[PDB]
A = this chain, B = another copy of it.
Amino acid sequence: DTHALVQDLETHGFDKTQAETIVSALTALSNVSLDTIYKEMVTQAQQEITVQQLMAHLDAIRKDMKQLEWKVEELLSKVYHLENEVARLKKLVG
């Protein structure tokens, strides 16, 4: 912050005006630089949103896979029951 920096310069061989204008210049470049960085780079907030979205895709796929697994298990049981019926039929006619 401004005070303790302007305060420091004044008490180490600078004027009021010299210390404030120096600090005005430091702030000026700081703020334009940060502004350029925040625009060009990826913020942690943007990253968090992207990651949540990718985890939402992964969760939807996992959910589908579970459902398909359950549907294959049901088909397997029905196939089992038909195998028994068919084996029984073969015996009757055979």
Closest Cβ–Cβ distance, residue A43 to chain B (whole Å): 6
**Total residues of chain A contacting the partner, CB 8 A:** 62
| Beta-carbon nearest neighbor of A77 in chain B | B79
For A33, the chain B residues whose CB sits under 8 A away are 30, 33-34
For A26, the chain B residues whose CB sits under 8 A away are 25-26, 29
Closest Cβ–Cβ distance, residue A88 to chain B (whole Å): 9
Task: Write the residues of chain A forming the contact surface with B, with a CB cutoff of 8 angstroms.
Answer: 5, 8-9, 12-15, 17-18, 20-30, 33-34, 36-47, 50-51, 54-55, 57-58, 61-62, 64-65, 68-69, 71-72, 74-76, 78-79, 82-83, 85-86, 89-90, 92-94
